[PDB]
Amino acid sequence: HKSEVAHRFKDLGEENFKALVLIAFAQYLQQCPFEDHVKLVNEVTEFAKTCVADESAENCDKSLHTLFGDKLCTVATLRETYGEMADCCAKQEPERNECFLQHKDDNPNLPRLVRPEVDVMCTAFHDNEETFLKKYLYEIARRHPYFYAPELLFFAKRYKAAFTECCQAADKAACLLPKLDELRDEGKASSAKQRLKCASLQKFGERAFKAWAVARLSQRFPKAEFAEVSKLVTDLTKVHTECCHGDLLECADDRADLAKYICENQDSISSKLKECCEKPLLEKSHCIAEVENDEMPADLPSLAADFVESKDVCKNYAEAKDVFLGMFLYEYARRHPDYSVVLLLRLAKTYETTLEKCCAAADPHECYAKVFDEFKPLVEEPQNLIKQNCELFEQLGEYKFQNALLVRYTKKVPQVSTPTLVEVSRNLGKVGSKCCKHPEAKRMPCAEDYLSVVLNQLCVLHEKTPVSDRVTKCCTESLVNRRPCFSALEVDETYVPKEFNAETFTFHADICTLSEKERQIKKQTALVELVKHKPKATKEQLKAVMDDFAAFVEKCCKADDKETCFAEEGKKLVAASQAAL
Template sequence: MRNTALVLFSALIVPALLADKGKNYTKENVCQELSAIGIEKFKEMVTVLYSQKFPNGTFEEVKCVADEMTKLAEKCCKDDASPDCYDKGATEISEKSCGKDSPFPKHPGIEQCCTLQGHERKLCLASLRYSADELPSLLEPTNEEICTEYTKHEKDYSVRYVYEFARRHRNIPAGFVLNATQHHVRMAERCCRPAVKIPCFLQERLQMESSNIFLRFLSNVCNNQVNLKSYKFGLSAYYGNLGLSFEEASAISSRFQSGLEKCCLQPQPECIIEELTSFQKVLCSESKLEAISEDFRKCCRKPALDTLPCVDVLKRQARQYPHVANPVSSQLCEEVQTHGIDRYLFVIGVKHASISLPVLTTVLDRIKSTVTACCSSADVTACLTEKESKLKKTTALLSKLDDTCSRYFKLDLPVFKTLIQKERGETQVQAWVHLATSCCSQRSPAQLCQKLTEDVIKYDDDTSV
């Protein structure tokens, strides 16, 4: 899928608001894409984009809006289409979106957009973003379930799979969803006729194993990038746990995050593939190989897109930095103290290797907010001194969370729950157990775990004297 796919979503919802030349350029790009991939693939791509945008919508609702957008593109890409075809069509669709009995997905915030008119309404509708917790991952169906669904919905099996897969991976490039769908549908076509063929399924699943591992990794890191405020600091600590120094970990995390920021929400897969391939070379450069473990080096011997998922599941080691500047010192904020706050957060983060990045990042963000607020105050030293107990308390909570996850991995769940109940009491046990069961694993859902961590922080604040 080429770069022209980038403009597809905004072009269909919001025609270019600038000069007529800009409108024509956008239309030309969309029409080129339609011509290049054909109407069916074009419709699938639109379905991906709207399934990701409206994960709370039903299949019928998403299909309806995708059909409307595809018809609009098809109509306005004809040689005899009027110059204002897109603008008029998008206006009609935005009005339909705001209708009382709209067949389109009911997106949170749409009521406010519908109070606007014209271009402002279309811009508002296009900017809406679903912010609720992530949907559970799409469980891999059994061979029999695949064949039953394929036989039942053979005509639209592909688009149904696109919908289900995309709404559960709403922060990865649409091209990956289409590729995964193509492989899945091919498997159903080959292995379900005339009856379920187990050897066929085994062979197909084996061929898709590597790409599925990469997709799970990509979905996780892109979800973190989109949703976590201080993801870079969590990443820096993560790479520190794998043996890199602060300087190396900081540079690596910045490079990785900038690539995700640039590419995760772009429809075409080429951008993220190029970025991650380039990043793997930096991560596995000769200068770092001496500092990293043998397991890390084994990951670096793999192909580029297999290296990063491999590194992602390596065992992390907590590290201690005994000689650290006192956080209440105003030197933390001085320009001569290069990356003072970053280093401070790194030192705190690398001490905790059992918690997931969403949990770690949420707590580090709280610490960062406190310190940066003081650095901007009139009397930095007085502010940091006043906040010292709060900083120590938050850091202590991070240690409690880390210890909780460490025990969660070692103990049976009933034993773990009993232990938490003794330590936290009835009022807090549910929050702590929910956080542990949902958020201790490395690939935890970012939005949910951010919320659960904030709940635990609130409990901790409320019980403080």
Template structure:
């Protein structure tokens, strides 16, 4: 099984690099003949659903059938040496057909202007960005068993497509374990004389494995989007708002250890790295932060449940802390590992625990641009002093606007929340037409419903915040 994982990574869309053809053909045929068509095709569904997570089931199905056909036709005794190469080349040609049934990708057209090797290598590199937040909803037990009994083959493949495309960021071995466990549950319970108690028992047993898939997908998604340094900042802000009593010096070691874990495990293909490494990081978090009663309660659970509990915790109420000043230019511009701006944002987040992390991240990015520009100027102190007053004013305005938006969203029913936005806009900007007011209110309501929540999707929310809250700077020079 582990060997075929590598093989499927190398033959997506069958655009293999000709320089490795002899090895790849031998590898493909060896694994196809060991696994058989069914298991080979199942793994092809998993790999390509992860690679093309926004493709339809029909597109993935066409692609998998093409890959399986390549192996089935050219991996038998007596075929010519050219069988494999010619069939792979024909699939490459098919990918460039505007009516191709394979997964759609905006980069296909630019790849298809090339010929031969360059085209194949270009097509092989294409990959859709994974979904930022899963949309898979599991059917009822009755629906599951109905679909399974109607056509087990299609049921298995469709489930593999749905599940793996939704958790494409989770480490491969975690997904393989979880999907195998789920399909075994379906086979056992849908053929049981007492399916209801069977499902209940099996779901209880599978809970840690599914939760590991959900959490590792969430964490690895953040790691992929943010990268190492940005993820450390994001995690530190999360802890500052959920445990505002914790100090920066206590939070950072746990954040750095967790980031190293993700760097090591998110791209792992053949082992249970994240499962093995997780408990050590959870132990450190609990050791450092369990003075907080809510953290202590989470830490009574099993490691993966503790992780889920910590990430699901709502933001705490802000605590009374001394006033906060933007660091001096000498602090912000000193060389080496400089965490002064991160410390400042951490402290700012402790004082504004209800301002979601995605809003704090946008603020941090904007301030970092100003700081970097001033620190690179001839007189950094003079530059920052000139900007400081405007920065403080704009930060205050941005935080106030974010707090008001998210505070009201979480306080009122959605319909009332939207009406309050409209009333506020009519009061603040009376010259706006009713249609423009409705348009802005719709934008703000949409922003709040997606981004004023725990674990909001960072890429989507960054674009939304820039568009909605950033609009206030359209007619004047703004730093943020």
């Protein structure tokens, strides 16, 4: 690699190269205009083609980090706009690159990206596809400077596909808007998972991340040997450590090296990687990360022969505790793709505790005899919660299931803001809509994937604006016991009911002109305030007020003088509700 810019240009291709260079510089110069970044991209791309033609050409021998930092230091207004970031230019490598890393500003002060009307977007898409798409790519990247650039490119290509299909359909909005919202949720969920793994790696440590990786990788590649899984776990931990640190190119090299090793050893890993390993380097690691679990060996025995019955259990444990516990996790996880990773970790921690007490006892076999009996209640707790909640989602609709969660969680923690209580309960209802359509065998991993992002969105907002010591405890405990903590939250008996406010329970004819979303949120906001004002109301008493409110809306939205109905039949509904409650 006399020329790494030329090797990357030949590997990625011109189109991918230009997009990734745009993202990389937009994530650093997050206050520079789009037209500046375009000239920078074209200047780097033309230089790269020079090196593709002749790798011996001037500056082609330099490292990509040196070329990136050099280009950053050619911006004429670097000190005017970014201040102390420009002082990184006085340093040399590798200190300059590290200096630029620290001054990457997460949460820039930028206005929220307003989604234009579908007709405006489709017209701009048609008349100027390149500038329309790349300007949007630039607005996303400058607002999310730590989002892994290739993954942002992967989302960006799905946005382009959505615009190509729906901008030609009959009802363009009916095609595009659900697709746009789906991509937005997918992007927020990806960013949430990434920042979760990084913060957990720092707070809880490397061993906890390794235990998580053993469980997930054993579920994914059950036909692999433990030595192969442990090798992948060690590599995956180094990958995430580097990627959490923030260097895009070092993170990309580590990821590609892992995907290369996996693709050269598919025979020892899994049988479902043939396609991902034929994909280009840009997409190889992404494909492997999302590939389905391999079918497990059907000839698998019980875990009793190696972990409770046989002698040399305490001896093998003391020889290498983490390795022995890892073997337990690998064997259990490969046999259980139906379990959440955190349940597998609860079972391994249960085994660890029991082995630590029993191996210090006179006849260890005696107290480590019935430890598989201790796994039953831990397995049943999430399974029961999923079965009952998926039954509730089938009885009611998604909306009325959201309203059930609304009353439940408002009663548990009534100090939370009404906007936050509404968004959380709405999201949790969508988790039921998607995971309860899975058979029981794939429901707990489904719930874990989505509950983790809802609970981190929750725990982030609480760190910034705290309201409950109980939520602080659940959010600061291990991620293994985060969901159980929230599940064990009980109805708050210290809550003082909020005082009545007539404006909160006064409704107008604008409710009939809103769309389903705005109407539902308006009603869901009032339901939270209803429970906050009358927290001792039963679900029967609440259903009576809700049913009355529903008839009040339907009648006054169909009346001739709609506004006075909402004012006169509204003051009747309020008074009768106050009497019943």
